[PDB]
Amino acid sequence: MEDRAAQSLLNKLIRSNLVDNTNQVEVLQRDPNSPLYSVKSFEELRLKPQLLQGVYAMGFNRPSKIQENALPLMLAEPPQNLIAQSQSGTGKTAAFVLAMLSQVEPANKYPQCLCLSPTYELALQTGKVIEQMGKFYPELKLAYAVRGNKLERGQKISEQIVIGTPGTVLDWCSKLKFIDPKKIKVFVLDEADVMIATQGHQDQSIRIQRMLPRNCQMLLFSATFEDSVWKFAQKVVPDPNVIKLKREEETLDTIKQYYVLCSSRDEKFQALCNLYGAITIAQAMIFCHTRKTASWLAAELSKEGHQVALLSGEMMVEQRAAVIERFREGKEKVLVTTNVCARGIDVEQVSVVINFDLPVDKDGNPDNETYLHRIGRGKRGLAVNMVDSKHSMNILNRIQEHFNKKIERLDTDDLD
Ligand SMILES: Nc1ncnc2c1ncn2[C@@H]1O[C@H](COP(=O)(O)OP(=O)(O)O)[C@@H](O)[C@H]1O
Incomplete structure (x- = not known):
């Protein structure tokens, strides 16, 4: 492939x-x-x-x-x-x-x-x-x-x-x-x-x-x-x-890794809205598994009053390039993307990563490469992982097992 x-x-x-x-x-x-x-x-x-x-x-x-x-x-x-x-x-x-x-x-x-x-x-x-x-x-x-x-x-x-x-x-x-x-x-x-x-x-x-x-x-x-x-x-x-x-x-030495526990996609969406509620989300990328999820997330965010740029495969490469460049100039604050659309792409000016879904390979195991390459980009960064099942929780624990650094639990409402 x-x-x-x-x-x-x-x-x-x-x-x-x-x-x-x-x-x-x-x-x-x-x-x-x-x-x-x-x-x-x-x-x-x-x-x-x-x-x-x-x-x-x-x-x-x-x-x-x-x-x-x-x-x-x-x-x-x-x-x-x-x-x-x-x-x-x-x-x-x-x-x-x-x-x-x-x-x-x-x-x-x-x-x-x-x-x-x-x-x-x-x-x-x-x-x-x-x-x-x-x-x-x-x-x-x-x-x-x-x-x-x-x-x-x-x-x-x-x-x-x-x-x-x-x-x-x-x-x-x-x-x-x-x-x-x-x-x-x-x-x-x-x-x-x-x-x-x-x-x-x-x-x-x-x-x-x-x-x-x-x-x-x-x-x-x-x-x-x-x-x-x-x-x-x-x-x-x-x-x-x-x-x-x-x-x-x-x-990952200069990066803060959190994860949030959720039960449904509707809760992952609320955890995220809460996150907007607390810190100002900017220069950030949100990764979803499917094009269906990405377009849904972007629609839901827009409805909530948050402007985001979508980055999915139905766009010609030149279109994705134009979006990405607007994102660099700060004309766009948040980028919603599928995994495949962003894989390997050197997007710059990204301080915050939100894994709306956790990165896995064709089989179903933790994709450590992609994770490290997203999060890694002594500059400070933020990474938030959305866990919504015992299964995806396992994945996170196995990611936190591969690297020897802890993913600190983040309570949805308590975000001090
Ligand atoms: N000697 C150089 N000095 C300054 N900039 C360069 C030099 N060589 C290449 N670049 C620039 O660096 C970028 C990468 O060059 P390029 O040859 O396209 O990379 P590659 O072919 O390895 O993907 C391009 O924007 C190019 O204009």
Whole structure:
């Protein structure tokens, strides 16, 4: 099961800047003999003038934690292959786009750089960065090799850069002969953790990678390294330098955890209204299990005079992005959401979490990951868990068992 694409898109639509990470980058140089090399500025990388111009113009002062290690590896001569894993928002897309723009020679009117995205909508996000960093390349044009593109059989395309989805790209490189694969200098496999979702996407990617010149630079980027992601990368990127950055560790040290005992949904709703009655609820998210519950809760709250924003799956991703952004600006004080709609999403400016229903997995057990990632976000936070059965009480006790910190009982009416 992979809702992966949607989540990856939403995270991009709302991302405004680099996520802060304090762990150190792990580099496994292809040759264990050769030393490690890092940079601390773009100038140190002797970039093509107009490319450097584009980099500053889009607001980048210096390379990010991950770029410090990737850029030099990618700009090495002769071109080395790279597998880079790091959580989203750490500068992976800016990196390989910089890589592509370095190798691309606008003089030559054929595809020189090829990037595979898992979906057209994600392709457009990469496409956005390219148009922006390479805005001082006059003759640089972009092509989308996607199922939607209605290109009629004919001559080869003249765009120096192609982005697209495995299925369409393979055809363009073979059957429909829109691209000469042997002329590709740089091949990027983006969002590997998302592309493994379809068995089809894997096989197609591999079969494309095999048509490339053997000295083509292969770059594969990924947020996570599940065993499946790893064994796939090994099949796509031969002789790889490997960059790994450990995901930031969420911390419940600065957070107050409560739970309220209830007997029905109607009581959970009253506990919550009481909570509004006591403290001013703002910058808060309320998590429900089903879309049915979320829309009901939001309707009931509105009726009680509380304005809330709903975040459920019937909304297009762009709509969820607009809501989330209003929530960040403080235009919205409270966000009601289903679990799935918020899973993995890096919503910012959240001081208060209300688990209207407790987070569980497909089976029925405590979803410790999701809990920690919600609550964790030395800044003070509030977390309130609504328990409404002996069963959901068990879940809470098992959550309080996993972590070794107590969830203090909170009496509905007594909230001093
Ligand atoms: N060197 C840099 N300096 C400042 N900001 C950057 C730099 N590289 C990327 N960013 C910004 O950080 C955010 C994450 O970049 P991105 O490459 O999209 O992350 P990823 O591809 O790893 O998900 C984006 O908003 C991007 O504009």
